[PDB]
Design a binder for this molecule. Sequence first.
Ligand SMILES: Cc1cc2nc3c(=O)[nH]c(=O)nc-3n(C[C@H](O)[C@H](O)[C@H](O)COP(=O)(O)OP(=O)(O)OC[C@H]3O[C@@H](n4cnc5c(N)ncnc54)[C@H](O)[C@@H]3O)c2cc1C
Ligand SMILES: Cc1cc2nc3c(=O)[nH]c(=O)nc-3n(C[C@H](O)[C@H](O)[C@H](O)COP(=O)(O)OP(=O)(O)OC[C@H]3O[C@@H](n4cnc5c(N)ncnc54)[C@H](O)[C@@H]3O)c2cc1C
Lengths: 401, 401
Amino acid sequence: ALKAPVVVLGAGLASVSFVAELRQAGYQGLITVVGDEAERPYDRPPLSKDFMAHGDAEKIRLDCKRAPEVEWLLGVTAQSFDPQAHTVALSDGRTLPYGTLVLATGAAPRALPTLQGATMPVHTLRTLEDARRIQAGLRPQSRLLIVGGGVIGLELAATARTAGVHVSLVCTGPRLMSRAAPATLADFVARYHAAQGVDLRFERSVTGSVDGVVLLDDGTRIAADMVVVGIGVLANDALARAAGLACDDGIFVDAYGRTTCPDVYALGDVTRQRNPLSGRFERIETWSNAQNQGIAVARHLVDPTAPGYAELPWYWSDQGALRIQVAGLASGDEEIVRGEVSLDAPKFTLIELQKGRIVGATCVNNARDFAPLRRLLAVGAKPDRAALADPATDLRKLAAA
Amino acid sequence: ALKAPVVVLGAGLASVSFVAELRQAGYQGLITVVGDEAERPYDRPPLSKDFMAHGDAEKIRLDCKRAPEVEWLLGVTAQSFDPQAHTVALSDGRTLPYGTLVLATGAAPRALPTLQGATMPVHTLRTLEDARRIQAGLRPQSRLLIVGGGVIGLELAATARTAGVHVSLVCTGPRLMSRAAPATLADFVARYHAAQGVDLRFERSVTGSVDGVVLLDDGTRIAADMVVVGIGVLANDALARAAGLACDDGIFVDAYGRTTCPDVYALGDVTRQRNPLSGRFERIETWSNAQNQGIAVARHLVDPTAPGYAELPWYWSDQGALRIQVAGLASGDEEIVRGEVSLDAPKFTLIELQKGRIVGATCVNNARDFAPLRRLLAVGAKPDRAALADPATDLRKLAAA
Ligand SMILES: Cc1cc2nc3c(=O)[nH]c(=O)nc-3n(C[C@H](O)[C@H](O)[C@H](O)COP(=O)(O)OP(=O)(O)OC[C@H]3O[C@@H](n4cnc5c(N)ncnc54)[C@H](O)[C@@H]3O)c2cc1C
Ligand SMILES: Cc1cc2nc3c(=O)[nH]c(=O)nc-3n(C[C@H](O)[C@H](O)[C@H](O)COP(=O)(O)OP(=O)(O)OC[C@H]3O[C@@H](n4cnc5c(N)ncnc54)[C@H](O)[C@@H]3O)c2cc1C
């Protein structure tokens, strides 16, 4: 089952969460983690917000103290593994033996092929190195172009506007946050950013660029001092593909984190896994998944009687004055709206239902409602839809009653 | 690796192909096959053609002679397996131990929820039992309604017309054969069936039925003496799901046939696997996949130095006067047409290219061209597009030259 020594590839949140849980659960054998970035392990969400704005990396490091006696090989790239020999080949010339190999290599931003041979600054925002580069360009009154409608770009947009940067945004879809966001939320978020001065361009695609100007598929132009591309990510599953594991933009795993290769597991952004609400396999790119899937896989490795990963998906996004939380599915056969949807002091809750059962929820600036809604969601609650809409209802009381 | 005893669940083409290859490759340990149908193992393609027309099941049995010393438990359903205990629970009360478990349980026709409580004859066409039931209703001048635009229904359509049965067909898509068929082929096939008297209804959905009449989403009616539903299939992956394997309408496997559960493999229609041409995971529902994936998985189990499954997808469909063969992808950036596309003595070849490389081919009544085209496809050939179109070109010579 759990055979020593343990080797983990990748040193992001999923990896740290996994190795801390192994130790906490009682595994005392060797643990070695291989991390290609030459950085003390760190959390990524601040890179679009407080770090981008204030620049102190020592406020964003992950706490590894619950993971004693781990050798962290930082600035080292795993180049291949041999699943018959049970070895991993490292970029520094060394080889590591393993009893159990864990792939926690995350995902990397997709490049924009139309900006391939561009001669103006084009960045993505994934690493501390990216953030530092971008941050050095957030000069007040500079012109920033964001490509893509996802949350990371929108988080950057808010930070940039607060810094006095002019921000334009190009989105191929008809709405922002096309993945895992109710349309009601997406529409409101566009209204918010527009009111904050973001110049939004929907159903546009970047066709190329010429001397400091971006070209679009409608035949028009946008001039920018910098482009930040955020059109999604691709799983870092190359080692798994080469070694013969089942992969398709992500390594397929079950609820125990098992790949198709014996003694090899995977967790975090690199995985394609079952979403219990949809019953379909998806690559879940959330902070909560990285942490919770890592913990669950470790727990079951040390104690095989433990259940497999069972958590329902959720995330947050902090976009200026909007503290957004979203759980479960974006839609069902019914949406209930609690509160008014307004740019004047935004505060509201959405609830998605499917045949009476809660299958998703959204809170904007309403954290107190989010936790009980996640509990109701987890057990597939079917509350009175009238009470759910009635603003005199206490959802926290409901999650108990 | 290959640990005895071997137990296979399912006794269709994939299973038979797998067990014959184990024996041929030199494995002499126990093999037990569990098959829920109480039938000598048989091939399914004749069920829409020669069997449906002529009714002799002893002309469609699979040859199991290359699989000596196998116990076939026919008419027995595997109800669960315990992958820790390495046992399988059978419907007759017995339990089988395994060293290696192989899931070859295929797929079952999707039902039409709108015909759920229908009171007129509604069948699917998958088993010998189905075929016998349907065949007993192919009375000349009866009215048959086929639901779905796939090849099995179209094969039945031809057989029924030859028997003097009136045939109508309802298809939710704008074209027949929407999966894995070039549009040029799909359009021609519709022309053929229409000319043979099939009453085709495109972009229609069945909404229900009342006393011998089918209702559609355009608000209209079709009266039929029998409905045969062929709107696709769903993988029979329930045992795998219950036992904790990674599944999503099909069991995920790699090129060795490995599932996410150690000592458990899967092959055939039940699997979701990599299509090397698209590089994506798909459930491949072809006869050639069932046979060739089964052989490849068995070969590598007995001889681990053998390569994994590497075959590119292809199928045939016999639809009256049209002997159709299709390999690879339905489209690329270019289609080359060899010959005329005509209802007068149909004979033509299509070639699909992507940046000069052949990625797919179709032959209609042109078998001699199909084999060399499959060879060109397999090595990603990039022939002169002018020669490919030039009817004086010999493709067989090309596959060598
Ligand atoms: C700017 C930004 C903002 C974000 N904000 C939010 C948010 O608002 N809400 C939210 O839910 N999530 C947010 N996320 C955070 C996010 O969800 C987590 O960072 C992520 O889910 C963590 O997953 P991970 O540990 O699996 O992968 P990663 O964090 O990508 O870690 C994987 C590491 O493995 C390394 N690696 C890859 N290949 C190799 C190799 N061959 N050898 C050695 N190392 C290798 C990678 O370079 C990487 O360092 C944000 C992310 C970013 C970038
Ligand atoms: C009418 C018809 C026409 C066809 N014509 C064509 C064609 O023109 N071209 C083409 O390429 N293909 C055609 N196919 C043939 C087809 O492609 C093969 O039959 C199929 O791919 C074989 O796959 P299989 O062995 O994996 O699954 P199956 O043939 O479905 O065999 C699986 C068996 O396992 C059984 N089983 C399931 N669960 C259990 C359990 N718990 N315990 C025990 N047994 C179980 C199933 O009942 C079934 O008997 C046609 C199929 C049909 C039905």
